[PDB]
């Protein structure tokens, strides 16, 4: 069985996700409009990413144990993980019907071409879509989804981490919760090697983070493109 502490961890992570992920996508109306007709989708997608960063932070602050870290380490973990958690949380809007992120209306349905119109190439987008399909195919329980985001954030091996032992301690508590959850609550056959597959997804995310970082560096180096970003994106991802 799940211990009471493990049940507690899951309850808190579910609530945290519900408080930071609006499945109606109502706030998207506040973003600069999408334009499809260069880099025409950069203002909209920069605003989507900026908003998403704010939400990833709100979720992270609620991870049991996250508060016990120094603000320095909190910063390092959030800076390094932001794009990966956005990629993870985006799986909720992703649909394999047509390989797109469907956020409720034609205006807010993003396909491969929209992402390339934010300054990105297939070198990133092809593995990104393959990641999204592989992740969908795991048919994760919401419980597993929120634990995986939490484990993603509290990763002791991120560059610049000071108290790695404490970060590892918090991550182990989440990892063990996830393994026990799978054992007790995820029935076979769907549970077959499920934890190892979830961890492989974290590995894939590191490669996606690297390639995104490379393409973002190149994008943002052009002052006309960085003019289109937000102050939070520049602070988190880089300002040339």
């Amino acid at each position: 069985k799940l211990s009471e502490e493990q049940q507690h961890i899951i309850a808190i992570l579910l609530d945290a996700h519900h408080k930071t992920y609006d499945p109606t996508y109502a706030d998207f109306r506040d973003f600069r409009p999408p334009v499809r007709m260069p880099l025409s989708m950069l203002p909209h997608l920069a605003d989507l990413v900026s908003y998403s960063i704010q939400k990833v932070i709100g979720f992270a602050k609620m991870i049991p144990g996250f508060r016990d870290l120094t603000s320095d380490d909190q910063i390092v973990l959030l800076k390094s993980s932001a794009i990966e958690v956005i990629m993870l949380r985006s799986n909720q809007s992703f649909t394999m019907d047509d390989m797109s992120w469907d956020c409720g209306s034609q205006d807010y349905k993003y396909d491969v071409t929209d992402v390339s119109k934010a300054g990105h190439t297939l070198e990133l987008i092809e593995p990104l879509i393959k990641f999204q399909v592989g992740l969908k195919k795991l048919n994760l329980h919401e419980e597993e989804h929120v634990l995986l985001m939490a484990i993603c954030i509290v990763s002791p091996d991120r560059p610049g981490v000071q108290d790695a032992k404490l970060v590892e301690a918090i991550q182990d508590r989440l990892s063990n919760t996830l393994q026990t959850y799978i054992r007790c609550r995820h029935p076979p056959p769907g549970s077959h090697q499920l934890y190892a597959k979830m961890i492989q997804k974290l590995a894939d995310l590191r490669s996606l983070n690297e390639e995104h970082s490379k393409q973002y560096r190149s994008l943002s180096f052009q002052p006309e493109n960085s003019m289109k970003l937000t102050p939070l994106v520049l602070e988190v991802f880089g300002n040339e």
């Binding site: 603000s71 800076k79 939070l232």
Partner: peptide
């Protein structure tokens, strides 16, 4: 590094 916005959002 100076991350005033991230720092602000992290506040309790």
């Amino acid at each position: 590094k100076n991350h005033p916005m991230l720092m602000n959002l992290l506040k309790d």
